[PDB]
Design a protein around this nucleic acid. Structure first.
Lengths: 88, 98, 130, 88
DNA sequence: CGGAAATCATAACCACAATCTTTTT
DNA sequence: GAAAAAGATTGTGGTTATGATTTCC
């Protein structure tokens, strides 16, 4: 629907956890909804920057700009690396 | 990955949005991965303090509470100066009911 | 298999009167669907040849359906022990076309205490464990 | 979704055609829809034989009985052979 | 329309309580 | 005959490999 598939989210949560660990269904549902709000959140600020700048396509630099201003700077440098190894 | 298409859909649900570059959903797929991992890492800290080996909703709730940059998530379980970010978070929370 | 068993079961279970299905039934059906496709395609290719074409087309399938009596249950898709007597068989085709709309292809749970036990039980990696 | 996967149907069709032959999109879609009707037609008739005999599990002999009844007798003998030879 | 590449959906896997079918009483 | 125990066989869901569809040309 309006969420990323819970099975992808589950797969990623496990990677952050030990083998011993198990995850509740409602914990998967919560993370799923947070993941979606994160997209809406970042997209919101980036979209705002584009309308201020008279442009109408959101690009990667917009998204990266939004993460830096919203406190997610830790993601920016690995994301840049990832962009280019993908060949941008 | 995380599926490019459902990312694009979620992005375009904001009416204001207009056009999206092709690199943007690919960039979000990796960023959502990192976000899931940080949220999980810090939720797991809570579950350990309570000597359980199961990650529960209230662990995620505690991590959202504990870490400021997760402010925007406050409604799910009922760089910028600390307070300019607060204003961007509040305007976002009010658009969410719209 | 050349046709997915689970998807066969799904189509079978869209009939509300179906309860349980033996493990052979889908396996048998996968092979019967294969023969049905071969026969349907064989006869459709005739019509393409009569029309001096190299491409098989919807109207070829329709011609085969129209030419082949036992395919008359399929007349709706292309608008505009002994075998039953053509007339007896005809009545079963009409009752089939009568029932056709009532088919629901959404997931339905038919045995709830099974679902109760399946959601409470050990899984190694999604799989049921001992 | 109510159909078998169009790629698999398409593979089986090609085995009945010459190498030359080509198959349109609409011909694949039509055959795909016909196969689903075949299953429903056979399954409904086998389902009735089960009710009449106050049984609740549709089995292979119910399918074979319906096929003969509805005029697909030509499949029955190969299917019975297919039953046993697969079954091992 | 077929084919290659990229993207994404899901069928198969697992085993046992529940339930169906046969044999006993 | 009817009831009941024995014996036989499926439905059920979380994960991921498998391969189905979507995109190009």
């Amino acid at each position: 629907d309006r969420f990323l598939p819970i099975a992808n989210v589950s797969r990623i949560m496990k990677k952050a956890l030990p083998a011993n660990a198990k995850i509740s269904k409602d914990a998967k549902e919560t993370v799923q909804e947070c993941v979606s709000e994160f997209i809406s959140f970042i997209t919101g600020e980036a979209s705002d920057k584009c309308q201020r700048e008279k442009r109408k396509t959101i690009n990667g630099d917009d998204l990266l700009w939004a993460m830096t201003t919203l406190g997610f700077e830790d993601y920016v440098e690995p994301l840049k690396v990832y962009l280019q190894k993908y060949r941008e | 990955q995380l599926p490019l298409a459902r990312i694009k859909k979620i992005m375009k649900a904001d009416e204001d949005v207009r056009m999206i570059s092709a690199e943007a959903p690919i960039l979000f797929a990796k960023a959502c991965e990192l976000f899931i991992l940080e949220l999980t890492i810090r939720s797991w800290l809570h579950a350990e303090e309570n000597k359980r080996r199961t990650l529960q909703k209230n662990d995620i709730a505690a991590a959202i509470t504990r870490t400021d940059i997760f402010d925007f998530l406050v409604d799910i379980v009922p760089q910028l100066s600390p307070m300019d970010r607060e204003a961007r978070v509040l305007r976002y929370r009010e658009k969410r009911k719209t | 298999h050349q046709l997915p068993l689970a998807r066969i079961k799904k189509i079978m279970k869209a009939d509300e009167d179906v309860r349980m299905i033996s493990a052979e039934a889908p396996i048998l059906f996968a092979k019967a669907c294969e023969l049905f496709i071969l026969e349907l395609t064989i006869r459709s290719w005739l019509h393409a040849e009569e029309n001096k074409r190299r491409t098989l087309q919807k109207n070829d399938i329709a011609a085969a359906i129209t030419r082949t009596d036992i395919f008359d249950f399929l007349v709706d898709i292309v608008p505009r022990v002994t075998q039953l007597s053509p007339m007896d068989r005809e009545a079963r085709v009409l009752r089939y076309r009568e029932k056709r709309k009532t088919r629901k292809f959404e997931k339905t749970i038919r045995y709830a205490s099974r679902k109760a036990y399946a959601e409470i039980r050990p899984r190694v990696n999604g799989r049921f464990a001992k």
